[PDB]
PDB file of all heavy atoms in Angstrom:
ATOM      1  N   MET C1318       7.256 -13.250 -16.584  1.00 58.25           N
ATOM      2  CA  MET C1318       6.010 -12.636 -17.052  1.00 58.25           C
ATOM      3  C   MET C1318       5.863 -11.146 -16.661  1.00 58.25           C
ATOM      4  O   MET C1318       5.093 -10.409 -17.288  1.00 58.25           O
ATOM      5  CB  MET C1318       4.836 -13.463 -16.600  1.00 58.25           C
ATOM      6  CG  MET C1318       4.843 -14.863 -17.194  1.00 58.25           C
ATOM      7  SD  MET C1318       4.887 -14.887 -19.027  1.00 58.25           S
ATOM      8  CE  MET C1318       4.963 -16.642 -19.316  1.00 58.25           C
ATOM      9  N   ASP C1319       6.631 -10.705 -15.664  1.00 60.82           N
ATOM     10  CA  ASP C1319       6.760  -9.296 -15.321  1.00 60.82           C
ATOM     11  C   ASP C1319       7.753  -8.542 -16.163  1.00 60.82           C
ATOM     12  O   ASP C1319       7.889  -7.325 -16.030  1.00 60.82           O
ATOM     13  CB  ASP C1319       7.058  -9.107 -13.822  1.00 60.82           C
ATOM     14  CG  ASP C1319       5.874  -9.390 -12.950  1.00 60.82           C
ATOM     15  OD1 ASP C1319       4.734  -9.255 -13.418  1.00 60.82           O
ATOM     16  OD2 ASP C1319       6.036  -9.774 -11.774  1.00 60.82           O
ATOM     17  N   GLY C1320       8.464  -9.230 -17.047  1.00 61.63           N
ATOM     18  CA  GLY C1320       9.384  -8.592 -17.959  1.00 61.63           C
ATOM     19  C   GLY C1320      10.825  -8.614 -17.476  1.00 61.63           C
ATOM     20  O   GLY C1320      11.642  -7.933 -18.047  1.00 61.63           O
ATOM     21  N   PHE C1321      11.147  -9.449 -16.482  1.00 62.07           N
ATOM     22  CA  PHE C1321      12.561  -9.519 -16.004  1.00 62.07           C
ATOM     23  C   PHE C1321      13.319 -10.694 -16.547  1.00 62.07           C
ATOM     24  O   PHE C1321      12.713 -11.715 -16.939  1.00 62.07           O
ATOM     25  CB  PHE C1321      12.565  -9.557 -14.478  1.00 62.07           C
ATOM     26  CG  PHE C1321      11.857  -8.378 -13.885  1.00 62.07           C
ATOM     27  CD1 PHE C1321      10.877  -8.531 -12.944  1.00 62.07           C
ATOM     28  CD2 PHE C1321      12.107  -7.105 -14.394  1.00 62.07           C
ATOM     29  CE1 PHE C1321      10.217  -7.435 -12.416  1.00 62.07           C
ATOM     30  CE2 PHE C1321      11.436  -6.004 -13.887  1.00 62.07           C
ATOM     31  CZ  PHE C1321      10.501  -6.171 -12.877  1.00 62.07           C
ATOM     32  N   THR C1322      14.645 -10.590 -16.539  1.00 59.75           N
ATOM     33  CA  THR C1322      15.492 -11.691 -16.921  1.00 59.75           C
ATOM     34  C   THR C1322      15.737 -12.544 -15.685  1.00 59.75           C
ATOM     35  O   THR C1322      15.969 -11.984 -14.623  1.00 59.75           O
ATOM     36  CB  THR C1322      16.837 -11.181 -17.465  1.00 59.75           C
ATOM     37  OG1 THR C1322      16.601 -10.407 -18.637  1.00 59.75           O
ATOM     38  CG2 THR C1322      17.770 -12.350 -17.834  1.00 59.75           C
ATOM     39  N   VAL C1323      15.619 -13.864 -15.814  1.00 60.32           N
ATOM     40  CA  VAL C1323      15.954 -14.831 -14.756  1.00 60.32           C
ATOM     41  C   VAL C1323      17.156 -15.635 -15.173  1.00 60.32           C
ATOM     42  O   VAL C1323      17.223 -16.126 -16.276  1.00 60.32           O
ATOM     43  CB  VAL C1323      14.770 -15.772 -14.440  1.00 60.32           C
ATOM     44  CG1 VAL C1323      15.142 -16.809 -13.404  1.00 60.32           C
ATOM     45  CG2 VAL C1323      13.609 -14.929 -13.945  1.00 60.32           C
ATOM     46  N   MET C1324      18.111 -15.782 -14.255  1.00 59.59           N
ATOM     47  CA  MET C1324      19.258 -16.603 -14.507  1.00 59.59           C
ATOM     48  C   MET C1324      19.864 -17.000 -13.171  1.00 59.59           C
ATOM     49  O   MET C1324      19.490 -16.451 -12.146  1.00 59.59           O
ATOM     50  CB  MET C1324      20.298 -15.846 -15.372  1.00 59.59           C
ATOM     51  CG  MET C1324      20.958 -14.689 -14.651  1.00 59.59           C
ATOM     52  SD  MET C1324      22.170 -13.822 -15.686  1.00 59.59           S
ATOM     53  CE  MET C1324      21.108 -12.870 -16.761  1.00 59.59           C
ATOM     54  N   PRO C1325      20.768 -17.990 -13.164  1.00 61.00           N
ATOM     55  CA  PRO C1325      21.409 -18.364 -11.890  1.00 61.00           C
ATOM     56  C   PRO C1325      22.265 -17.223 -11.291  1.00 61.00           C
ATOM     57  O   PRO C1325      22.813 -16.399 -12.037  1.00 61.00           O
ATOM     58  CB  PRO C1325      22.311 -19.549 -12.268  1.00 61.00           C
ATOM     59  CG  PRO C1325      21.742 -20.084 -13.560  1.00 61.00           C
ATOM     60  CD  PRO C1325      21.214 -18.861 -14.264  1.00 61.00           C
ATOM     61  N   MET C1326      22.371 -17.166  -9.963  1.00 64.02           N
ATOM     62  CA  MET C1326      23.130 -16.093  -9.319  1.00 64.02           C
ATOM     63  C   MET C1326      24.579 -16.077  -9.822  1.00 64.02           C
ATOM     64  O   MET C1326      25.146 -15.005  -9.997  1.00 64.02           O
ATOM     65  CB  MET C1326      23.108 -16.234  -7.784  1.00 64.02           C
ATOM     66  CG  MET C1326      23.880 -15.150  -7.034  1.00 64.02           C
ATOM     67  SD  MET C1326      23.239 -13.494  -7.300  1.00 64.02           S
ATOM     68  CE  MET C1326      21.982 -13.432  -6.026  1.00 64.02           C
ATOM     69  N   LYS C1327      25.135 -17.235 -10.099  1.00 63.78           N
ATOM     70  CA  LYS C1327      26.523 -17.339 -10.558  1.00 63.78           C
ATOM     71  C   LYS C1327      26.738 -16.563 -11.853  1.00 63.78           C
ATOM     72  O   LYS C1327      27.852 -16.099 -12.122  1.00 63.78           O
ATOM     73  CB  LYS C1327      26.943 -18.813 -10.755  1.00 63.78           C
ATOM     74  N   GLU C1328      25.704 -16.460 -12.670  1.00 62.16           N
ATOM     75  CA  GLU C1328      25.777 -15.686 -13.906  1.00 62.16           C
ATOM     76  C   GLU C1328      25.419 -14.258 -13.645  1.00 62.16           C
ATOM     77  O   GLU C1328      26.108 -13.377 -14.165  1.00 62.16           O
ATOM     78  CB  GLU C1328      24.949 -16.288 -15.051  1.00 62.16           C
ATOM     79  CG  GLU C1328      25.306 -17.734 -15.393  1.00 62.16           C
ATOM     80  CD  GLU C1328      26.781 -17.930 -15.734  1.00 62.16           C
ATOM     81  OE1 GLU C1328      27.396 -17.040 -16.376  1.00 62.16           O
ATOM     82  OE2 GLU C1328      27.342 -18.978 -15.351  1.00 62.16           O
ATOM     83  N   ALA C1329      24.376 -14.013 -12.844  1.00 62.83           N
ATOM     84  CA  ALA C1329      23.917 -12.656 -12.624  1.00 62.83           C
ATOM     85  C   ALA C1329      24.990 -11.736 -11.987  1.00 62.83           C
ATOM     86  O   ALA C1329      25.104 -10.551 -12.360  1.00 62.83           O
ATOM     87  CB  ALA C1329      22.667 -12.667 -11.757  1.00 62.83           C
ATOM     88  N   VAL C1330      25.800 -12.292 -11.082  1.00 63.64           N
ATOM     89  CA  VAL C1330      26.807 -11.485 -10.380  1.00 63.64           C
ATOM     90  C   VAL C1330      27.887 -10.958 -11.320  1.00 63.64           C
ATOM     91  O   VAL C1330      28.485  -9.964 -11.015  1.00 63.64           O
ATOM     92  CB  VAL C1330      27.514 -12.213  -9.219  1.00 63.64           C
ATOM     93  CG1 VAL C1330      26.523 -12.466  -8.102  1.00 63.64           C
ATOM     94  CG2 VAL C1330      28.200 -13.497  -9.680  1.00 63.64           C
ATOM     95  N   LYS C1331      28.104 -11.591 -12.468  1.00 64.37           N
ATOM     96  CA  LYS C1331      29.105 -11.114 -13.426  1.00 64.37           C
ATOM     97  C   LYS C1331      28.770  -9.756 -14.056  1.00 64.37           C
ATOM     98  O   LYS C1331      29.674  -9.047 -14.450  1.00 64.37           O
ATOM     99  CB  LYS C1331      29.337 -12.138 -14.533  1.00 64.37           C
ATOM    100  CG  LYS C1331      29.848 -13.478 -14.046  1.00 64.37           C
ATOM    101  CD  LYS C1331      29.774 -14.476 -15.177  1.00 64.37           C
ATOM    102  CE  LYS C1331      30.313 -15.833 -14.750  1.00 64.37           C
ATOM    103  NZ  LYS C1331      30.033 -16.858 -15.804  1.00 64.37           N
ATOM    104  N   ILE C1332      27.484  -9.407 -14.123  1.00 68.09           N
ATOM    105  CA  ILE C1332      27.064  -8.128 -14.715  1.00 68.09           C
ATOM    106  C   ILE C1332      26.380  -7.192 -13.734  1.00 68.09           C
ATOM    107  O   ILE C1332      26.028  -6.075 -14.119  1.00 68.09           O
ATOM    108  CB  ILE C1332      26.193  -8.327 -15.978  1.00 68.09           C
ATOM    109  CG1 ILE C1332      24.872  -9.040 -15.674  1.00 68.09           C
ATOM    110  CG2 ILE C1332      26.955  -9.108 -17.049  1.00 68.09           C
ATOM    111  CD1 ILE C1332      23.922  -9.030 -16.836  1.00 68.09           C
ATOM    112  N   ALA C1333      26.243  -7.568 -12.467  1.00 69.08           N
ATOM    113  CA  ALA C1333      25.482  -6.767 -11.508  1.00 69.08           C
ATOM    114  C   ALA C1333      26.194  -5.445 -11.150  1.00 69.08           C
ATOM    115  O   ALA C1333      27.379  -5.455 -10.881  1.00 69.08           O
ATOM    116  CB  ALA C1333      25.267  -7.572 -10.258  1.00 69.08           C
ATOM    117  N   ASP C1334      25.471  -4.328 -11.156  1.00 71.58           N
ATOM    118  CA  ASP C1334      25.880  -3.082 -10.489  1.00 71.58           C
ATOM    119  C   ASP C1334      25.391  -3.053  -9.039  1.00 71.58           C
ATOM    120  O   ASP C1334      26.074  -2.561  -8.151  1.00 71.58           O
ATOM    121  CB  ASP C1334      25.337  -1.894 -11.277  1.00 71.58           C
ATOM    122  CG  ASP C1334      25.910  -1.828 -12.673  1.00 71.58           C
ATOM    123  OD1 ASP C1334      27.177  -1.694 -12.721  1.00 71.58           O
ATOM    124  OD2 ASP C1334      25.157  -1.948 -13.694  1.00 71.58           O
ATOM    125  N   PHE C1335      24.190  -3.597  -8.832  1.00 70.48           N
ATOM    126  CA  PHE C1335      23.631  -3.739  -7.491  1.00 70.48           C
ATOM    127  C   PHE C1335      23.161  -5.171  -7.328  1.00 70.48           C
ATOM    128  O   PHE C1335      22.585  -5.754  -8.285  1.00 70.48           O
ATOM    129  CB  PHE C1335      22.374  -2.871  -7.307  1.00 70.48           C
ATOM    130  CG  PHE C1335      22.621  -1.398  -7.401  1.00 70.48           C
ATOM    131  CD1 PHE C1335      22.530  -0.754  -8.622  1.00 70.48           C
ATOM    132  CD2 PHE C1335      22.931  -0.667  -6.275  1.00 70.48           C
ATOM    133  CE1 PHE C1335      22.691   0.624  -8.705  1.00 70.48           C
ATOM    134  CE2 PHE C1335      23.164   0.727  -6.370  1.00 70.48           C
ATOM    135  CZ  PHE C1335      23.011   1.374  -7.566  1.00 70.48           C
ATOM    136  N   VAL C1336      23.352  -5.749  -6.151  1.00 69.95           N
ATOM    137  CA  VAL C1336      22.744  -7.041  -5.831  1.00 69.95           C
ATOM    138  C   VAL C1336      21.964  -6.804  -4.551  1.00 69.95           C
ATOM    139  O   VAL C1336      22.574  -6.426  -3.516  1.00 69.95           O
ATOM    140  CB  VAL C1336      23.789  -8.139  -5.585  1.00 69.95           C
ATOM    141  CG1 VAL C1336      23.080  -9.427  -5.214  1.00 69.95           C
ATOM    142  CG2 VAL C1336      24.721  -8.332  -6.793  1.00 69.95           C
ATOM    143  N   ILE C1337      20.663  -7.016  -4.593  1.00 72.09           N
ATOM    144  CA  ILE C1337      19.766  -6.862  -3.463  1.00 72.09           C
ATOM    145  C   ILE C1337      19.207  -8.223  -3.052  1.00 72.09           C
ATOM    146  O   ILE C1337      18.544  -8.860  -3.871  1.00 72.09           O
ATOM    147  CB  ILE C1337      18.625  -5.906  -3.758  1.00 72.09           C
ATOM    148  CG1 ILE C1337      19.112  -4.614  -4.465  1.00 72.09           C
ATOM    149  CG2 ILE C1337      17.831  -5.587  -2.486  1.00 72.09           C
ATOM    150  CD1 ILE C1337      20.220  -3.844  -3.787  1.00 72.09           C
ATOM    151  N   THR C1338      19.501  -8.704  -1.843  1.00 72.71           N
ATOM    152  CA  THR C1338      18.967  -9.957  -1.374  1.00 72.71           C
ATOM    153  C   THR C1338      17.663  -9.671  -0.669  1.00 72.71           C
ATOM    154  O   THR C1338      17.616  -8.934   0.325  1.00 72.71           O
ATOM    155  CB  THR C1338      19.902 -10.712  -0.433  1.00 72.71           C
ATOM    156  OG1 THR C1338      20.254  -9.871   0.667  1.00 72.71           O
ATOM    157  CG2 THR C1338      21.164 -11.090  -1.166  1.00 72.71           C
ATOM    158  N   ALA C1339      16.599 -10.273  -1.186  1.00 71.06           N
ATOM    159  CA  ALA C1339      15.255 -10.077  -0.656  1.00 71.06           C
ATOM    160  C   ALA C1339      14.618 -11.416  -0.305  1.00 71.06           C
ATOM    161  O   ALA C1339      13.400 -11.480  -0.215  1.00 71.06           O
ATOM    162  CB  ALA C1339      14.408  -9.373  -1.699  1.00 71.06           C
ATOM    163  N   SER C1340      15.425 -12.449  -0.120  1.00 73.37           N
ATOM    164  CA  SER C1340      14.993 -13.858  -0.254  1.00 73.37           C
ATOM    165  C   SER C1340      14.740 -14.583   1.046  1.00 73.37           C
ATOM    166  O   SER C1340      14.107 -15.641   1.050  1.00 73.37           O
ATOM    167  CB  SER C1340      16.066 -14.651  -1.021  1.00 73.37           C
ATOM    168  N   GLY C1341      15.258 -14.055   2.156  1.00 70.12           N
ATOM    169  CA  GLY C1341      15.179 -14.757   3.434  1.00 70.12           C
ATOM    170  C   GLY C1341      15.798 -16.152   3.429  1.00 70.12           C
ATOM    171  O   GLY C1341      15.213 -17.092   3.965  1.00 70.12           O
ATOM    172  N   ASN C1342      16.967 -16.281   2.793  1.00 71.22           N
ATOM    173  CA  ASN C1342      17.815 -17.481   2.874  1.00 71.22           C
ATOM    174  C   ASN C1342      19.162 -17.117   3.524  1.00 71.22           C
ATOM    175  O   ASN C1342      19.504 -15.928   3.669  1.00 71.22           O
ATOM    176  CB  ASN C1342      18.061 -18.057   1.474  1.00 71.22           C
ATOM    177  CG  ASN C1342      16.882 -18.861   0.948  1.00 71.22           C
ATOM    178  OD1 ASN C1342      16.533 -19.899   1.515  1.00 71.22           O
ATOM    179  ND2 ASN C1342      16.270 -18.396  -0.168  1.00 71.22           N
ATOM    180  N   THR C1343      19.909 -18.136   3.917  1.00 71.18           N
ATOM    181  CA  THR C1343      21.296 -17.985   4.340  1.00 71.18           C
ATOM    182  C   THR C1343      22.219 -18.036   3.101  1.00 71.18           C
ATOM    183  O   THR C1343      21.873 -18.674   2.088  1.00 71.18           O
TER     184      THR C1343
END
Side-chain angles (χ1 to χ4, degrees), chain C residues 1318-1326 1328-1339 1341-1342:
Chain C
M1318 297 304 177
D1319 287 334
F1321 303 129
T1322 298
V1323 177
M1324 69 180 76
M1326 180 62 87
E1328 303 304 323
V1330 293
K1331 299 169 179 171
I1332 63 170
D1334 297 299
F1335 296 90
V1336 178
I1337 315 306
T1338 56
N1342 282 295

